[PDB]
A = this chain, B = another copy of it.
């Protein structure tokens, strides 16, 4: 005959269907920096060059990504960006570390070595 179904049975017999929150999973093949910036941002200007430099000094070893929050509002919004710049240090495994505000080449490297490269 016809079979009667509880939500419980439904999960086992039809579909385990709830859209469970996705766990953080980095897809890059190298550690990376993610720099959320804007053009009306002050420090971001004195920092951009410092970044370009580190992108060479650690070329081959890390990626440095920049995101213009104005050109990508959905993304910035999805990630609760507030202080500018907002800087992300993303390792090949584990949660990103997030630093609200500007940093010096020294402090940056500190995070690049200690966090991106598990030094």
Contact = CB atoms under 8 A, between A and B. Distances in A.
Interface string A1-37: 1111111001011111111011011111000101100
A14 B72 CA distance: 15
Interface of A: 1-7, 10, 12-19, 21-22, 24-28, 32, 34-35, 48, 51-52, 55-56, 63-68, 71-72, 74-75, 78, 90
25 contacts: A1-B64, A2-B48, A2-B55, A2-B64, A2-B65, A3-B63, A3-B65, A3-B66, A4-B68, A5-B34, A5-B65, A6-B71, A7-B75, A10-B75, A13-B65, A14-B26, A14-B27, A14-B34, A14-B90, A17-B22, A17-B24, A17-B78, A18-B22, A19-B19, A19-B22
